[PDB]
Design a protein around this nucleic acid. Structure first.
Ligand SMILES: Nc1nc2c(ncn2[C@H]2C[C@H](O)[C@@H](COP(=O)(O)OP(=O)(O)OP(=O)(O)O)O2)c(=O)[nH]1
Ligand SMILES: [Mg+2]
Ligand SMILES: [Mg+2]
Length: 430
DNA sequence: ATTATGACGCT
DNA sequence: AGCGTCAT
């Protein structure tokens, strides 16, 4: 009863940029705006692999991981932008730099956790206390929430989507207790007002549109963000969780879309997140381990305690390239030339990072995949990263992998290499 | 021949 | 440390 934690202590937002790489290319090339378009890596094999898709193109069934030649069968007028190639490999610098633009804007409002190139969590708890102090119990106008959906509303006793959005928002605002500065629903609402402001700032200052979720923790904020894309934001209240989860496939919750989620389904004989509530915490721990079990017990009740980490910069800087089927590297000269290409991109990015961010990486991780191995990584070895020198890094990477060569000949490489990966890690301030 | 990352957990 | 999972 009165002691049962409800996980309503924080206001957390998740901001995800809509079809990010597409928007970066559409900003640069206005001929791509408001068109079905996609971003592709490479071109020779099946037209290149699609990694981002505009919402107009998604209406035709174009998806990520589709070959552009097949996408063109679904959408013959699909427009394509190609990722830049440098030193023989895909170079994502333009999108990393665009991401920095967005993350700096969001950092003006609150401390953010960079979760990916195009999404960040925001801890708005303190900003919400501030805005509530400034409001002085003044009600929140629907005008301040022009792109907000309230999940689960409207409910109870129009045939157009904006009309439904506004009915739901009206029902929500009508039920608000605006004189209770500690009401979680009011705090979420103020958080949504702030996120409207943040998203407006991102669009004004970059041209990019985004979606967002506002809830009491990261998992619900992420889930919420996905409910009304593109260019909209969604508030998921604590009270909305029983109905939301009652039909929510377990795999939709972040961390459960893989083997653990499949095992929850098969072991417990359930389909939906809400069905987890019928198990004790000890039962879930017995199947899925102490940490997963406690997390699932709380998560299916809408409660999650994982903090928004104050981290705007990536923890690692890496370069990787696959060498599929017959492009596999089978000679020493090959392996060395490509280690050097990867190392030269890494050196460029590391030098920029040291100048921008006052830090130096101290460990170089070298990962490879050999032909025939099913695992995405066949071997990981670390060595010291003591100088930002591409020839030195590529020589060191060769030194740490050179005994994987089964060939008795010194010039041949067997089994041939289908993937090279260099990653700089363990940053120290400088 | 799904590609290029990147975070985090396990032991 | 090296490997696995999950994300996309
Ligand atoms: N290189 C590479 N980049 C990827 C891959 N998957 C996604 N990305 C990039 C391109 C996307 O624009 C960007 C952000 O991914 P998201 O999952 O947020 O999707 P996106 O923003 O494209 O669309 P969304 O509106 O969020 O559904 O990450 C991939 O497999 N390889
Ligand atoms: Mg994202
Ligand atoms: Mg996506």
């Amino acid at each position: 009863g009165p002691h049962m934690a409800t996980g309503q202590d924080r206001v957390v937002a998740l901001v995800d940029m809509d079809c990010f790489f597409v928007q970066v290319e559409q900003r640069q090339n206005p001929h791509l705006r408001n068109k079905p378009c996609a971003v592709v890596q490479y071109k020779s094999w099946k037209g290149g692999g699609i990694i981002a898709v505009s919402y107009e193109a998604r209406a035709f069934g174009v998806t990520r991981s589709m070959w552009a030649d097949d996408a063109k069968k679904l959408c013959p007028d699909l427009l394509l932008a190609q990722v830049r190639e440098s030193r023989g490999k895909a170079n994502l610098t333009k999108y990393r730099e665009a991401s920095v633009e967005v993350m700096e804007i969001m950092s003006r409002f609150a401390v953010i956790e960079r979760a990916s190139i195009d999404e960040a969590y925001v801890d708005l708890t303190s900003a919400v206390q501030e805005r509530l102090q400034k409001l002085q119990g003044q009600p929140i106008s629907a005008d301040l929430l022009p792109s907000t959906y309230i999940e689960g509303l409207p409910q109870g006793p129009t045939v157009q989507k904006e009309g439904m959005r506004k009915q739901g928002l009206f029902q929500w605002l009508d039920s608000l207790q605006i004189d209770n500065l500690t009401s979680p629903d009011l705090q979420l609402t103020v958080g949504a007002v702030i996120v409207e402001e943040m998203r407006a700032a991102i669009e004004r200052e970059t041209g990019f549109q985004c979606s967002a979720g506002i809830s009491h923790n990261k998992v619900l904020a992420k889930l919420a963000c996905g409910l009304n894309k593109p260019n909209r934001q969604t508030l998921v209240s604590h009270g909305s969780v029983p109905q939301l989860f009652s039909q929510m496939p377990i795999r939709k919750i972040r961390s459960l879309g893989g083997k653990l989620g499949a095992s929850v389904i098969e072991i417990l004989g359930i389909e939906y997140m809400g069905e987890l509530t019928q198990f004790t915490e000890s039962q879930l721990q017995s199947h899925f381990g102490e940490k997963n079990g406690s997390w699932l017990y709380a998560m299916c009740r809408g409660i999650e305690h994982d903090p928004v980490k104050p981290r705007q910069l990536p923890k690692t800087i890496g370069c990787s390239k696959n060498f599929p089927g017959k492009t596999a590297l089978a000679t020493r000269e090959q392996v060395q030339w490509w280690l050097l290409q990867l190392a030269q991109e890494l050196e460029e990015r590391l030098t920029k990072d040291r100048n921008d961010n006052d830090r130096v990486a101290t460990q170089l991780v070298v990962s490879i995949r050999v032909q025939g191995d099913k695992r995405l990584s066949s071997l990981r070895r670390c060595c010291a990263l003591t100088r930002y020198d591409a020839h030195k890094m590529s020589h060191d990477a060769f030194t740490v992998i050179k005994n994987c060569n089964t060939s008795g000949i010194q010039t041949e490489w067997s089994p041939p290499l289908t993937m090279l990966f260099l990653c700089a890690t363990k940053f120290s301030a400088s």
